[PDB]
């Protein structure tokens, strides 16, 4: 269409649903909505196949039972323990009970899974997975496709979206949400990086399927595109974000590249050794030495380097020895790791150890959501109150299936399950044919003004310099082992970086593929989420899952079994404060098919 707001060409679209994101969660949600007969659009900054979901390597967890006898209820118990009793058991049951179906559906659309001798899907061992509610042994639930299980899923979900004919707006950077005065999302306001035009997508139900904000740290396994844009949009809408202090460091990341070595490497026989040549992981998490929870392994590795038993000339990292394993298994089951090591590390997996170090990988926090993927705006009386027209899925969302620590091969499962759930939930709300949404009168006004103010920004500090400052502070003030003093120092520093965004300046003033402007808009999202992370972490005076305070080294179930909600006071990052409130965790499973897993010790 054609309008002119503040001198910008504004096009108007009026769909029944809009999905921001074309990663795993977004591609699944879109295909589902279209399959339900609803008119839908799917906005993405990159071609859907270039999303970070493609970089996944391990696999997706399902109680298929192809390798050993299995029950979904056992998978559910493992997830509760792994979450350190911070995840909702309602959402965990829904995800685990659907994991078999979701994985088979993906195979039905052509996902090239690895196969067994009977023609079934091969499943590999992963950390934190057991049988018989912990009384059994290692559980092989991770349906993998070689070392390329992400590439497979994302390509297959794109194919499914093509089969259903999903309307895609590729290379469109979403800026904000078109919120109503009452408090309901009425769509999104995006820009095209290829034409330079602003588009006001108006939908009855919006699905935020962006990724995480892992690029807010100096060393991450995340993509440069992982800036947490949907979280910033929600925060600038005045809505809460949850559990942002729980940032997962993956135990093995190539040193110092920051690339990821699949946990499947250890799940197929890989051993971590130190300067003394010891498989030290037996001392911590003895029953599952290297296949312990990712948070335990990372803390063990950090303590070992700290104790002086680190490998390398600088004694700064740890060694992962896959050399002892058969060369055929390495070539067949870990085909991608070998090449990446040969390049970014110069290591021959079959003959040499790989240098590794704990690196930020995933973010358990995100938009608060219920088990139906409806975003929540909790109130003192209604902790389960939901934003009327908003839903979330993927790493961006926090249904708290993963709680304080995510079990490997459960995120890709959350992408498919909750993307599907989000499509089902909208179907019930919005009918296949409905009168068009009434975009509010001043829809985008503020967003256009801010975009123009940032476009014509001529201040002293550069976006890159400010980003490096933030990345440094997060890496140094929120490491694997956090202390309260540093957390306070950092909280002051991030607040300064917040008020420094008012001095950022860009040199390019065009609108077609202006990476300078896009990256400055992304830095706003990165700053707000990174700020809420430090504030929430300093406020949590306990040690649960990935959050490991040296000052407080013990879980506090009595006073800290709560979800942590952060709020940005004002829409402008340089004019806002991070307020913290809390909401209770859902402990009762949604049906009786699964029982409540009582809070307990997490030894691994």
């Amino acid at each position: 269409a054609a309008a002119a707001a503040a001198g910008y060409a504004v096009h108007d679209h009026f769909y029944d649903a809009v999905v921001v994101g074309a990663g795993g969660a977004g591609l699944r949600a879109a295909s589902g909505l279209v399959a339900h007969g609803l008119k839908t659009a799917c906005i993405s900054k990159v071609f859907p196949t270039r999303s970070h979901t493609v970089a996944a390597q391990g696999g997706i967890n399902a109680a298929l039972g192809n390798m050993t006898e299995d029950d979904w209820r056992w998978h559910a118990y493992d997830t509760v323990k792994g979450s350190d009793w911070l995840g909702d058991q309602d959402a965990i049951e829904h995800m685990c009970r659907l994991a078999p179906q979701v994985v088979l559906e993906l195979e039905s659309y052509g996902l090239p899974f690895s196969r067994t001798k009977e023609g079934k899907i091969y499943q590999r061992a992963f950390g934190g997975q057991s049988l018989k509610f912990g009384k059994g042994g290692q559980a092989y639930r991770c349906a993998a496709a070689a070392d390329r299980t992400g590439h497979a899923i994302l390509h297959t979900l794109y194919g499914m979206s093509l089969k259903y004919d999903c309307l895609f707006f590729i290379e469109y950077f979403a800026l904000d949400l078109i919120m109503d005065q009452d408090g309901s999302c009425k769509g999104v306001i995006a820009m095209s990086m290829e034409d330079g035009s602003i588009h006001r997508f108006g939908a009855h139900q919006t699905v935020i399927a962006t990724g995480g904000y892992g690029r807010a740290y100096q060393s991450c396994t995340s993509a440069h595109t992982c800036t947490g844009d949907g979280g910033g949009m929600v925060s600038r809408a005045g809505l809460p974000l949850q559990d942002l202090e729980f940032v997962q460091f993956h135990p093995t990341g190539i040193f110092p590249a920051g690339c990821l070595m699949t946990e499947g490497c250890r799940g197929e026989g890989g051993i971590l050794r130190n300067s003394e040549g010891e498989p030290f992981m037996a001392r911590y998490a003895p029953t599952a030495k290297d296949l312990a929870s990712r948070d335990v392994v990372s803390r063990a590795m950090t303590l070992e380097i700290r104790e002086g038993r680190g490998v390398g000339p600088n004694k700064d990292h740890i060694y992962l020895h896959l050399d002892h394993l058969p060369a055929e298994t390495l070539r067949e089951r870990l085909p991608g790791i070998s090449e990446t090591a040969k390049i970014f590390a110069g290591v021959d997996v079959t003959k040499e150890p790989i240098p590794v170090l704990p690196t930020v990988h995933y973010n358990m926090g995100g938009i608060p959501t219920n088990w139906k993927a409806q975003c929540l705006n909790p109130t003192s009386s209604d902790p389960n109150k939901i934003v009327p027209g908003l839903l979330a899925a993927g790493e961006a969302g926090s249904a708290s299936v993963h709680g304080a620590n995510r079990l490997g091969a459960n995120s890709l499962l959350d992408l498919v399950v909750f993307g599907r759930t989000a499509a089902d939930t909208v179907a019930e709300i919005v009918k296949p044919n409905s009168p068009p949404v009434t975009l509010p009168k001043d829809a985008g006004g503020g967003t256009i003004d801010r975009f123009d103010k940032i476009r014509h920004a001529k201040g002293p500090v550069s976006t890159a310099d400010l980003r490096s400052k933030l990345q440094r502070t997060m890496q140094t003030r929120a490491p694997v082992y956090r202390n309260g003093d540093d957390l306070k120092k950092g909280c002051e520093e991030v607040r300064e970086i917040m008020k420094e965004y008012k001095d950022v300046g860009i040199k390019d003033r065009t609108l077609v593929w202006n990476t300078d402007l896009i990256e400055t808009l992304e830095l706003e999202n990165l700053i707000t989420q990174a700020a809420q992370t430090i504030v929430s972490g300093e406020a949590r005076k306990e040690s649960r899952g990935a959050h490991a305070r040296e000052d407080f080294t013990e879980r506090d179930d009595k006073k800290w079994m709560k979800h942590s909600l952060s709020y940005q006071t004002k829409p402008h990052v340089e004019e806002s404060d991070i307020v913290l409130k809390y909401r209770p965790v859902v402990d009762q499973p949604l049906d009786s098919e699964m029982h409540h897993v009582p809070p307990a010790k997490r030894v691994y």
């Binding site: 990159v46 970089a55 039905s108 052509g110 067994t116 309307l167 440069h224 593929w513």
Partner: protein, 259 residues
């Protein structure tokens, strides 16, 4: 102190594209080319535009032309020398800005081959995974790893000349991947559609696609196999088969499709 000449075009000025030379200290830069480009953007000229996500070679977004040969900047190594390292956009592509190509035709052509599993019977209720042997899964080994970087595409002299008629190496390999997938049941339909003079037989075996592939795949070998299979399996009734499938797609939305 390496010198890096980089192609520069402003979509608004629409001034003739030019190569600008930058000087970078390799001591304070990462080994890969993409690190040099990021450093240039961060320090010297922030206007520089380029696509980059994964940093590990898997997304397929950093495809460029470095010193003549296509490649992914994140996996390409800086090679110091007196000679400036010339970085340009993908060959014979419309440049949206600086090093950002226009690959919309490549995306459309891929949608044409309909890369999703097709079966005559819908999965019966109570059915598990469709059976595929390890040997059958082995057939799809070197074809399912394509990251759509589009280097092989923009290295084929036949895609340079007839971009809008020739599907190109990457799309053709993906078509063979779905013609070779034992689970797919529309083998004849796919072969009939691909059996066109412009779509397939514009490949003259230059082998630039296999030489530049960043993932070490062999699109040239796949196209040769697909041509041999079609020649042996051709029947007079293939044209009718294509027509019947076209009728089946009558109610599809507006976009590239089987027809």
């Amino acid at each position: 102190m390496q010198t890096f000449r980089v192609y520069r075009y402003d979509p608004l000025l629409q001034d003739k594209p030019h190569m600008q030379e930058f000087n970078i200290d390799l001591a304070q830069c990462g080994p890969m080319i993409l690190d040099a480009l990021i450093k240039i953007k961060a320090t010297q000229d922030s206007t520089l535009a380029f696509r980059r996500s994964c940093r590990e070679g898997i997304c397929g977004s950093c495809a460029m032309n470095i010193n003549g040969k296509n490649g992914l900047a994140c996996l390409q190594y800086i090679e110091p020398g007196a000679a400036p390292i010339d970085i340009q956009p993908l060959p014979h592509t419309y440049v949206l800005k600086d090093l950002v190509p226009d690959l919309s035709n490549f995306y459309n052509q891929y949608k044409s081959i309909e890369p999703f599993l097709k079966r005559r019977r819908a999965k019966q209720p109570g059915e598990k995974e469709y059976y595929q042997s390890i040997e059958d899964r082995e057939k799809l080994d070197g074809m399912y790893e394509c990251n759509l970087c589009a280097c092989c595409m923009t290295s084929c002299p036949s895609y340079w000349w007839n971009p809008e008629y020739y599907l190109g190496p990457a799309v053709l390999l993906q078509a063979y991947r779905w013609i070779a997938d034992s689970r797919d049941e529309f083998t004849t339909e796919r072969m009939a559609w691909i059996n066109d003079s412009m779509r397939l037989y514009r490949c003259h075996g230059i082998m630039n696609c296999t030489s530049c592939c960043p993932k070490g795949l062999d699109p040239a070998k796949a196209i040769a196999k697909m041509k041999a299979a079609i020649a042996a399996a051709y029947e007079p009734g293939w044209t009718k088969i294509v027509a019947q499938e076209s009728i089946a797609n009558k109610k599809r939305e507006s976009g590239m499709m089987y027809a």
